Paper text:
We determined the crystal structure of the CAPN7(MIT)2–IST1322-366 complex to define the interaction in molecular detail and distinguish between the four possible binding modes in which individual CAPN7 MIT domains either bound simultaneously to both IST1 MIMs, as reported in other MIT:MIM interactions, or each CAPN7 MIT domain bound a different IST1 MIM element in one of two possible pairwise interactions. The structure revealed that each MIT domain binds a different MIM element, which is a configuration that has not been documented previously. The asymmetric unit contains two copies of the CAPN7(MIT)2 –IST1322-366 complex, and the flexible linkers between the different MIT and MIM elements could, in principle, connect the linked IST1 MIM-CAPN7 complexes in two different ways. The N-terminal IST1 MIM element binds in an extended conformation in the helix 1/3 groove of the N-terminal CAPN7 MIT domain, making a canonical ‘type 2’ (MIM2) interaction. The binding interface spans IST1 residues 324–332 (324VLPELPSVP332), which resembles the previously defined MIM2 consensus sequence (ΦPXΦPXXPΦP, where Φ represents a hydrophobic residue and X a variable (often polar) residue; Kojima et al., 2016). In the CAPN7-IST1 complex, IST1 Ser330 bulges away from the MIT domain to accommodate an intramolecular salt bridge formed by CAPN7 Asp21 and Arg63, and the peptide then bends back to allow Val331 and Pro332 to make hydrogen bonds and hydrophobic contacts, respectively. The C-terminal IST1 MIM element (349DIDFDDLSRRFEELKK364) forms an amphipathic helix that packs between helices 1 and 3 of the C-terminal CAPN7 MIT domain, making a canonical ‘type 3’ (MIM3) interaction. Core residues from the hydrophobic face of the IST1 helix are buried in the CAPN7 MIT helix 1/3 groove, and the interface hydrophobic contacts, hydrogen bonds, and salt bridges are nearly identical to those seen when this same IST1 motif makes a type 3 interaction with the MIT domain of SPARTIN.
One such cofactor was Calpain-7 (CAPN7), a ubiquitously expressed but poorly understood cysteine protease that had not previously been linked to abscission or to the NoCut checkpoint. CAPN7 contains tandem MIT domains that can bind specifically to the ESCRT-III subunit IST1. Many of these cofactors contain microtubule-interacting and trafficking (MIT) domains, which bind differentially to MIT-interacting motifs (MIMs) located near the C termini of the different human ESCRT-III proteins. Hence, IST1 recruits CAPN7 to midbodies, where its proteolytic activity is required to regulate and complete abscission.
Numbering used by the authors:
A (entry chain G): 324 to 332, 349 to 364
B (entry chain C): 1 to 69, 77 to 154
């Protein structure tokens, strides 16, 4: 008898962060 | 080869496909699902009296499409390019000491970064978006209320 199937189945932030880092100074 | 021999092969193929399907061995289960359907297709050509045959063909072939597994990545690539663009513009007004526009541009970047991070389950993307939002909010507040 034939069985059935189972129920079962960017950018670079870093240069931004670097520029943010220099800005806190 | 008559329907009776084809139906029996179809039962051994599908039984093996479903147990590989159970084992997550999805790529060999596709092969045996495809063998199962093909045995049934020949069986219907040979005059099969099996009453749910067309259904079971369609079941197995659909399971191959389900196991085979986009435009959302396209959308998120553009969203990130925009956030990067907005922050870049804000960087421009920041260095020119156009304080008010720099604040507006930093906070529009914030909204875009938080909003995009509700559109994804990738926790690494979520944190990168929230870190850029956090950083831009920090700088906007620094321009808005110098201590």
């Amino acid at each position: 008898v034939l069985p059935e199937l189972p129920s079962v189945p960017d950018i670079d932030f870093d240069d931004l962060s670097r520029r943010f880092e220099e800005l806190k100074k | 080869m008559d329907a009776t021999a084809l139906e029996r092969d179809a039962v051994q193929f599908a039984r093996l496909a479903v147990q590989r399907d159970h084992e997550g061995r999805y790529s060999e289960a596709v092969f045996y699902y495809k063998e199962a359907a093909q045995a049934l297709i020949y069986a219907e050509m040979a005059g099969s009296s099996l009453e749910n045959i067309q259904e079971k063909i369609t079941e197995y072939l659909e399971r191959v499409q389900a196991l085979h597994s986009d435009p959302l990545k396209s959308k998120h690539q553009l969203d990130l390019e925009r956030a990067h663009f907005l922050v870049t513009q804000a960087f421009d007004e920041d260095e020119k000491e156009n304080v008010e526009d720099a604040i507006e541009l930093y906070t529009e970047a914030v909204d875009l970064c938080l909003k995009t991070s509700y559109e994804t389950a990738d926790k690494v993307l979520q944190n990168k978006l929230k870190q850029l939002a956090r950083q831009a909010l920090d700088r906007a507040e620094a321009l808005s209320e110098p201590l």
